[PDB]
């Protein structure tokens, strides 16, 4: 990986810095690194791609070194360097593609493609140079088993799920009490509804609780909390839990009461926020507990009083919402997010060549299945393929 | 390590420490002068070497 | 552009690295490159401005070289370098502004301002050095005629359009069947509504379809699909198509049925997802086809049955929605997006100096008009001005 | 700060570049800078902590210089360098944490920790080298009184406030007219409601206005305008102004009419957008003025006319929305935003070690209270802690 | 940990190999390693802490080397070696005990005692030699990010739980249908009971299902499957779910029908066994799904027909059971098992010295709570203490 | 384009002016330009592409220089010149056809075919001469 990243980094630097008219002093060390790469790769045969529709490519390296007598780079120097760079970039792209389409249940963090296995020899370690990217940095730290960190904007940490729980119900579904939620991506929208508006409740308070268990620990998280859940604030017809029938939901939104957001690690309270809306910080957590109360307004205007009768039928159903958005966070494990394209890159490569389903990843890289069952082996393979995807993106993108 | 210092030839750190009076320990087989003069101890000649 | 970028990068590196106390070993190559820039630019006369309210400015270059014998930089070295850095930064900013406010139809990719045209001469290529930024990298790839690529977080690919289509309508607008949508930025909300709740439909199922054509091909796109359109889920009063009257919409939301999202390239299916929500990947596409269904519930509770009568009047109107949000994408062509600020920079520079509308961009740099009619000429000019904007942003 | 940043960047470059098998030519300058840092730091005693639960830690530097290799680095070199790198990284992280948990009403931009005060001495200026990060660049510019710039994606500029104003009301709350808004983070969602649907309003037009005063000037801002405010588009029960009673809101959404977004700076109109939705550019502003209108539709279908009678009761209340989203902007002062983790890091460090509330920041580093009262002293302290947080993020 | 293991292994080898009359060639390398350890440890001061009732102990090393010039070892050599070996063994045992009684939440895998932290310095790396034991080998492989596993005979993977689920019940508890189970250590017993013997069930079949979610993934597991649960095969009086009353269970055992045992990893069926009993292999799994059916015997002799009437009362209740024993398995993480003494050793050391309850492990090192909430921090601390316990067990 | 036009112009001038019996003074500059073109194109491999039904064609250039030292051009000179000119004319026609059938939305003024892109290299600028059309 370090050698593959070093190849890609050297090629990107060569493309960016070996330009017409530039002083040789600007590229002297880069030229030496490029020549070291040429020397190390020369005389080696590589083969990439025998899985799915990925074609078998054979790679031979017999290239001359770049000159070092110039004081300023001219057109011909740049053209020869660009030809060599183009061949090397094609090779690196194919190696990355071959590595991204493979997975191992045993040692998924180790190289899978024979090209990367060959590059993992001692003779190629000379190609290794500056590992400054975030993903390669985390790769090296994880190899040494130091504390890693991946910064995500809108981390995709909640597997998609839209469901409801009925604490009070009956076959007519005209007097219901429960919660409905959507946990998708970086967003949780929850809403507790009472059809009776807590008319017969213990002090006219109905307590609702939602527990979301993250499959990985998030640290240093900025979270936007908003009182209302707009997803569960319009009339709906919802199929029953058994699917036998359908019930009607007609929410009238009341502000949530005694809102409490609890961020817990290993069942231990790390952060607590009471009646706090806007931007909050969850420094270290793996579970979110949102507890909110529907409180019947003691005083009602004639219209509000008309909404909530003392007994059935209940045509307007009281609802109190909550929206949680993890704007950004840090996680020791790789994750899909709105900013990076690693998951998109791996999925695109796999689909473009119709890679058969392996024994590790979901049936097609479905992120919901992956994050739902984010196993240690899945984590290892996912980190490997994401690092390869970033290496490829340095050049192909 | 005086052997490593001799081999490298880089006296930047040792020179910086000697100039700035930074306590140090020079390690290596060294010949030494046995001085029995108390006046030499008062004169602090051991620091002038 | 490569020379202008190299000037900007050299000046940025001079600002960052030429600091008090730093070893000369840390800036040796940078000082050499800075002196090369001084040598190349010396004896040259440039002129910027003369368009709109942008003032006409004249630039002369007669600067001494920086020292090279220091071991650690001191205050005097930093001030001496800073004088020249300030002058050069002002020159670069003015050249970038002058270029940002100009456009051409046939050859909009080529430099427009006489300053940048002069900088395109061979003798200035000596200033050229490291081109590592994303925009300059793509500029060089385009010039070499290689494949380009721009990463966009929430790409601004869909021009704003809030519209509707009524496949079944009457003058009284009491039994309506159709679909209403908003395509804004990276977001597509659609909602198909049937006022009769598909009671008289062939299979008690009403089929809704929405086709959105992207003006550029997006690749490696990550999208989030959700089964409800919150935008069209509350009651509203909507003008008629010709504005002659207004009709009433009173949605009651049912889950969409047989959801199928298809990402097409040149009319050919590239990706297809059925009954799949959450995160999906569209690897390469320029069109989106969202097909969903409204299925009348075979079994209903008394309240649900009360909602949907056998015949008119239809006071509650069944609706099924879809939300499709593109979070990230890669495009060969420049686009506005949330994270970057090139569109804002170009628009700000054009507005601040009251640039008369040109023959290429829409008046006021309005993005919706730009992306609705995103022609190759507009793409050329937009890439040029965006690259210049990024170069300027390196300094300003 | 510059010295601490230089230490942190030297150590990050040491981690990234001193790797097994790498050419010595790839790290020659880096090794020279690292050895200079070792020379400068050796023989100095530093103390960190002593505030809250942050432990008191003593740091002594007695490290030998990194060696040289003829051609390539080997494993022995890497381990020997890594020991020193680990110690220095621990020291830098501890110093950054010590500096993040401190504040001062007077001279908040100056170092507050003993370690950073010592590092600001002349003897350590040798360590200073390349200052290329955005935060350190802005720090250096602000030290020189030059124009600063921070680019934010979804800037956290609006303190949370879900409020309403009733321009027409009465104790029965059955014929109301006013506006309700949510200003949260980078988002404004306003909605003007009229229960009478402007039946008696002159010209059948009701004018709604919302003025939002940003606490800092935003430049080069990309803004998304959408006609409808989904937050205030569904029925709800809202407390009274004084909380003595609850009233009922039953929106029916109409297209906002004569929409006008004015972006103003110091009371002067800078940008105007009339009936323009989608992406717009606010080049320089500190005030947003959204003026829209509810226009009674002159023609109504029977279903629409049934909702808007000539007189009371008004069961359905007309509402016109407006959504404004700052996707990205540039501000001269540090702010929280969706993309960065500076606020999160500082808050986490303060919470973890139970730092008692100081005389500058609000308890718990709550952002709403901080941005509500964003004083210049608070700006200085927050910029200092944010810069230290970025310096620490380089390593940790 | 590697240096501590090396000390322990050197001392164990010295005890086993330094015997009277043995050729020095049999211990040449062992004596070289012993002298290397003496040289490395000489002149160092160690302290084993006072946590709990464990006494504070100070250790000094000023030992001379062992002779290397005898053809055969004699009584003098053995006595002289033993005098040093006793002190070193005492030091190693005390260090191991000090490390076993400590836990950390942030970094539970790093050494906790100051003695082991001192031994983790570079200067002691010379003591390191052969690491052949399973636990130290796994420690090193896991430090290398390599796939390693512990082999367990009767792994203690199932937290103790005796519970029942009543899918059909009533206040009088006379017509019940449900499941009873005990999951203890490596053993699962389940029994689905129907009081009516599926007289009214669709097609006279009642389906029972039991899902056991392992807290860690097991590989290459040998499992004995037997068609009856003797634990739930006799009359019982069982508390109710809320403990309000007690109900009567009077099983009459029928053969389980349509037995399907599935071993699943990430929700996918890795292994399936239908109507197979005896030894089966679960190659890789983290969930066990046992499905079985109570089938009413179509033909019954008069004695059998007397047991199952058409209606209540039901005095004989038809039960079908399964037993699943994990004879052997392999796990990435450490576990208690019937063969190894690591858990017993750690618990004994914690109990003997009255170590207070820490933040990681449950009180008294209770294995049910430990394996129930098997957090990553608990896994790290447990692996560390188990490795130390094995190291100590080499000597004590 | 200028290089392709210059190739076509040189070939047309050679066809019109290299005729039997003509004085060498009438073709001296033409012969020099023709030899310059031969030297520039010699050793270069070209390929006209297979877009549509246009056949994939491969072109190799290894030709001798047109002779000097004739007071009046004879039939042998015209024969050799005609052979070389015919091969070059076929090449130029195929390159022109390959370029005529290609288009790009952006940078449509630049050469599209690989042959014309190769001819746009600096090493072929020598072939360029009078651009009078
Ligand atoms: Cl966003
Ligand atoms: Zn974003
Ligand atoms: Zn139900
Ligand atoms: Zn109409
Ligand atoms: Zn009021
Ligand atoms: Zn019971």
Largest CA distance in chain D: 94
Query: Which strand (E) or helix (H) includes residue E238?
Result: strand E236-239
Peptide linkage before C313 cis (omega within 30 of 0): yes
Distances in Å between the Cα of C197 and the Cα atoms of C171, C295, D181 are: 19, 8, 34
A374 close to A331: Cβ distance less than 8 angstroms = no
Tell me the three state secondary structure of residue C216.
strand
Q: Give me F20's structure tokens.
A: 């039997």
CA distance C230 to C228: 6
E210 close to E190: Cβ distance less than 8 angstroms = yes
DSSP secondary structure string for all residues of C173-187: -SS-EEEEEEEEETE
Strand boundaries in D49-169, DSSP class E: 57-60, 150-153, 158-168
F17 burial class (0-12, 13-18, 19+ CB within 10 angstroms)? middle
| A vs E: CB pairs below 8 A | 26
Beta bridge partners of C257: C293
Which has the closest alpha carbon to D389: D14, D92, D87? D92
Task: Kindly give, in sequence order, each residue whose CB lies less than 8 Å from that of residue E187, ignoring residues fewer than 6 positions away.
Answer: E158, E323, E324, E325, E326
Distances in Å between the Cα of D278 and the Cα atoms of C130, C337, D163, D326, E48 are: 37, 12, 25, 12, 69
CB contact under 8 Å between F106 and C145, yes or no, is no
Q: How many CA atoms lie within 13 A of C15 on its CB side?
A: 24
CA distance E298 to E182: 31
| A vs C: CB pairs below 8 A | 157
Pick from B2, B4, B12 the residue to mutate for testing the D interface (most D CBs within 10 Å): B12
CA distance F68 to F84: 16
Q: Which subunits sit against D, judged by 3+ Cβ pairs under 8 A? A: A, B, C
Tell me the three state secondary structure of residue E114.
helix
Across the interface, of D131, D300, D302, the residue whose CB is closest to C19 is: D131
In angstroms, what separates the C-alpha of C359 from chain A's closest C-alpha? 32
Distances in Å between the Cα of F133 and the Cα atoms of D3, E199, F30 are: 68, 103, 17
Q: Give me C75's structure tokens.
A: 């205050």
The two beta strands, D158-168 and D177-185, are antiparallel
Is D317 part of any known ligand binding site? no
Q: Give me A196's structure tokens.
A: 């009776």
CA distance A73 to C127: 11
Task: Kindly give, in sequence order, each residue whose CB lies less than 8 Å from that of residue F72, ignoring residues fewer than 6 positions away.
Answer: F21, F22, F23, F24
Distances in Å between the Cα of A242 and the Cα atoms of A239, A246, C191, E319 are: 8, 10, 27, 28
Which has the closest alpha carbon to C102: C114, C91, C120, C92? C114
Structure resolution, Å: 2.9
D177 close to D293: Cβ distance less than 8 angstroms = no
E317 burial class (0-12, 13-18, 19+ CB within 10 angstroms)? buried
Q: Which subunits sit against C, judged by 3+ Cβ pairs under 8 A? A: A, D, F
Q: How many CA atoms lie within 13 A of A52 on its CB side?
A: 19
CA distance C144 to C146: 6
Beta bridge partners of C293: C207, C257
DSSP letter at A3 equals: H
The two beta strands, D317-331 and D251-254, are parallel
Task: Kindly give, in sequence order, each residue whose CB lies less than 8 Å from that of residue A42, ignoring residues fewer than 6 positions away.
Answer: A61, A62, A63
Tell me the three state secondary structure of residue D131.
coil
Strand boundaries in chain A, DSSP class E: 45-48, 57-60, 150-153, 158-168, 177-185, 187-194, 205-226, 236-239, 246-249, 251-254, 257-265, 268-274, 278-295, 317-331
Distances in Å between the Cα of D172 and the Cα atoms of B10, D169, D193, F89 are: 90, 8, 16, 96
A289 close to D161: Cβ distance less than 8 angstroms = no
User: Given its phi and psi angles, is residue D58 left (phi above 0), alpha (psi -120 to 50 degrees) or beta?
Assistant: beta
Task: Kindly give, in sequence order, each residue whose CB lies less than 8 Å from that of residue C350, ignoring residues fewer than 6 positions away.
Answer: C52, C100, C101, C365
CA distance C185 to C153: 11
Across the interface, of C284, C302, C304, the residue whose CB is closest to A237 is: C304
CA distance A307 to A304: 5
Task: Kindly give, in sequence order, each residue whose CB lies less than 8 Å from that of residue C40, ignoring residues fewer than 6 positions away.
Answer: C123, C124, C126, C127
CB contact under 8 Å between A375 and E143, yes or no, is no
Distances in Å between the Cα of D20 and the Cα atoms of A2, D65, D71 are: 10, 18, 12
CA distance F43 to E379: 71
CA of residue E244 to ligand 6 center, whole Å? 8
D24 close to D69: Cβ distance less than 8 angstroms = yes
Distance of alpha carbon C224 from the chain centroid: 19
Task: Kindly give, in sequence order, each residue whose CB lies less than 8 Å from that of residue D130, ignoring residues fewer than 6 positions away.
Answer: C16, C17, C19, C22, C26, D6, D9
CA of residue A385 to ligand 4 center, whole Å? 52
Other Cβ atoms within 10 Å of D272 Cβ, number: 12
Tell me the three state secondary structure of residue C367.
helix
CA distance F19 to F75: 8
Which has the closest alpha carbon to E134: E377, E344, E393? E393
Ligand nearest to the CA of A243: 3
CA distance A34 to A16: 13
DSSP letter at D159 equals: E
CA distance C26 to D198: 71
Angle of helix C134-144 relative to helix A2-17, nearest 10 degrees, comes to 70
CA distance F113 to F104: 11
Largest CA distance in chain C: 94
DSSP secondary structure string for all residues of A160-188: EEEEEEEEE--TT-SS-EEEEEEEEETEE
CB contact under 8 Å between D237 and A2, yes or no, is no
CB contact under 8 Å between D182 and A226, yes or no, is yes
Range D119-144 burial, b when 16+ CB lie within 10 A, else e: beeeebbbbbbbbebebbbbbbebee
Angle, vertex CA E394, rays to CA E393 and CA E395, nearest 5: 85
> What's the sign of the alpha-carbon dihedral C340, C342, C347, C353?
positive
CB contact under 8 Å between A339 and C36, yes or no, is no
CA distance E101 to E54: 9
Across the interface, of D17, D21, D237, the residue whose CB is closest to A297 is: D237
CA distance E59 to E62: 10
Tell me the three state secondary structure of residue C337.
strand
DSSP letter at A289 equals: E
CA of residue A154 to ligand 1 center, whole Å? 7
CA distance E317 to C305: 44
Range A302-334 burial, b when 16+ CB lie within 10 A, else e: ebbeebbeeeeebebbbbbbbbbbbbbbbbbbb
Task: Kindly give, in sequence order, each residue whose CB lies less than 8 Å from that of residue B44, ignoring residues fewer than 6 positions away.
Answer: none
Q: How many CA atoms lie within 13 A of E346 on its CB side?
A: 28
D394 close to D9: Cβ distance less than 8 angstroms = yes
Tell me the three state secondary structure of residue A237.
strand
Which has the closest alpha carbon to E190: E242, E236, E237, E227? E227
The values of phi and psi at residue C46, to 5°, are: -120, 155
The position carrying tokens 């209108």 is: D293
The C-alpha torsion from D122 through D128 and D134 to D140, rounded to 10°, is 30
CA distance E69 to A381: 55
C325 close to C212: Cβ distance less than 8 angstroms = no
CA distance D318 to D253: 6
CA distance C350 to C54: 9
D99 close to D7: Cβ distance less than 8 angstroms = no
The two beta strands, C205-226 and C278-295, are antiparallel
CB contact under 8 Å between F107 and C379, yes or no, is no
Distance of alpha carbon A31 from the chain centroid: 37
CA distance F63 to A139: 59
User: Given its phi and psi angles, is residue E140 left (phi above 0), alpha (psi -120 to 50 degrees) or beta?
Assistant: alpha
Contacts of A106 in chain E (CB under 8 A): 147
The H-assigned helical ranges of chain C are 2-17, 28-41, 75-100, 114-119, 134-144, 302-307, 342-352, 367-372, 376-395
Is E266 part of any known ligand binding site? yes
> What was the experiment behind these coordinates?
cryo-EM
The position carrying tokens 């830690």 is: D57
The helix/strand count (H/E) of chain D reads as 9, 14
CA distance A286 to A268: 10
The position carrying tokens 């909702």 is: D307
CA distance F133 to F128: 14
Q: Give me F127's structure tokens.
A: 């072939």
Task: Kindly give, in sequence order, each residue whose CB lies less than 8 Å from that of residue A146, ignoring residues fewer than 6 positions away.
Answer: none
CA distance C188 to F46: 49
A191 close to A176: Cβ distance less than 8 angstroms = no
Range C215-232 burial, b when 16+ CB lie within 10 A, else e: bbbbbbbbbbbbbbbbbb
Query: Which strand (E) or helix (H) includes residue E99?
Result: helix E75-100
In angstroms, what separates the C-alpha of C376 from chain F's closest C-alpha? 6
The position carrying tokens 């899985």 is: A51
Q: Give me D135's structure tokens.
A: 């935060």
- Cβ-defined contacts of F49-58 (< 8 Å, 24+): F49/F98, F49/F113, F49/F114, F49/F115, F51/F98, F51/F101, F51/F102, F52/F101, F54/F97, F54/F98, F54/F101, F57/F94
DSSP secondary structure string for all residues of F33-91: HHHHHHHHHTT-EEEE--STTPPPEEEE---PPPP---SB--HHHHHHHHHHHHHHHHH
Nearest-Å Rg of the Cα atoms of chain E is 28
Tell me the three state secondary structure of residue D155.
strand
CB contact under 8 Å between C330 and A347, yes or no, is no
A338 close to C222: Cβ distance less than 8 angstroms = yes
Q: How many CA atoms lie within 13 A of D86 on its CB side?
A: 10
Tell me the three state secondary structure of residue F131.
coil
């Amino acid at each position: 990986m370090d050698v593959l990243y070093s190849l890609s980094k050297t090629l990107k630097d060569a493309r960016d810095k070996i330009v017409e008219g530039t002083l040789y002093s600007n590229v002297s060390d880069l030229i030496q690194q490029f020549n070291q790469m040429i020397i190390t790769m020369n005389g080696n045969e590589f083969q990439t791609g025998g899985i799915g529709n990925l074609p078998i490519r054979n790679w031979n390296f017999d290239f001359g070194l770049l000159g070092t007598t110039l004081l300023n780079l001219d057109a011909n120097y740049v053209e020869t360097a660009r030809n060599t760079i183009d061949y090397f970039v094609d090779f690196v792209d194919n190696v990355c593609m071959d590595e991204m389409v493979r997975e191992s249940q045993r040692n998924g963090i180790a190289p899978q493609s024979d090209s990367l296995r060959k590059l993992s020899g001692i003779k190629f370690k000379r190609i290794n140079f500056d590992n400054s990217s975030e993903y390669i940095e985390n790769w090296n730290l994880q190899n040494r088993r130091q504390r890693t960190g991946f910064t995500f904007h809108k981390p995709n940490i909640f597997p998609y799920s839209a469901s409801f729980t009925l604490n009070r119900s009956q076959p007519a579904h005209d007097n219901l009490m429960g919660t409905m939620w959507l946990n998708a991506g970086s967003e949780i929208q929850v809403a507790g509804f009472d059809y009776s508006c807590a008319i017969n409740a213990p002090a006219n308070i109905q307590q609702f609780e939602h527990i979301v268990q993250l499959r990985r620990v998030l640290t240093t998280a900025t979270i936007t909390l908003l009182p209302d859940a707009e997803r569960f604030s319009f009339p709906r017809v919802i199929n029953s839990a058994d699917g036998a029938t359908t019930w009607y939901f007609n929410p009238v939104i009341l502000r949530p009461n005694n809102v409490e957001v609890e961020f817990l690690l290993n069942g231990q309270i790390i952060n607590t926020y009471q009646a706090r809306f806007g931007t909050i910080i969850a420094r270290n957590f793996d579970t979110i507990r949102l507890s909110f109360q529907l409180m019947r307004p003691p005083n009602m205007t004639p219209a509000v009083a008309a909404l909530f009768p003392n007994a059935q039928p209940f045509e307007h159903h009281a609802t109190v919402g909550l929206t949680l958005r993890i704007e950004s966070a840090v996680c020791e494990s790789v994750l899909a997010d709105a900013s990076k394209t690693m998951l998109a890159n791996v999925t695109s490569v796999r689909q473009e060549y119709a890679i058969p389903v392996g024994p590790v990843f979901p049936p097609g890289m479905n992120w919901t299945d992956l994050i739902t069952n984010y196993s240690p082996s899945r984590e290892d393979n996912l980190q490997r393929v994401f690092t390869v995807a970033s290496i490829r993106s340095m050049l192909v993108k | 390590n005086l052997e490593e210092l001799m081999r490298t030839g880089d006296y930047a750190q040792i020179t910086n420490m000697l100039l700035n009076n930074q306590p140090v320990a020079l390690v290596g087989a060294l010949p030494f002068i046995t001085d029995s003069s108390v006046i030499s101890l008062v004169a602090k000649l051991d620091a002038t070497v």
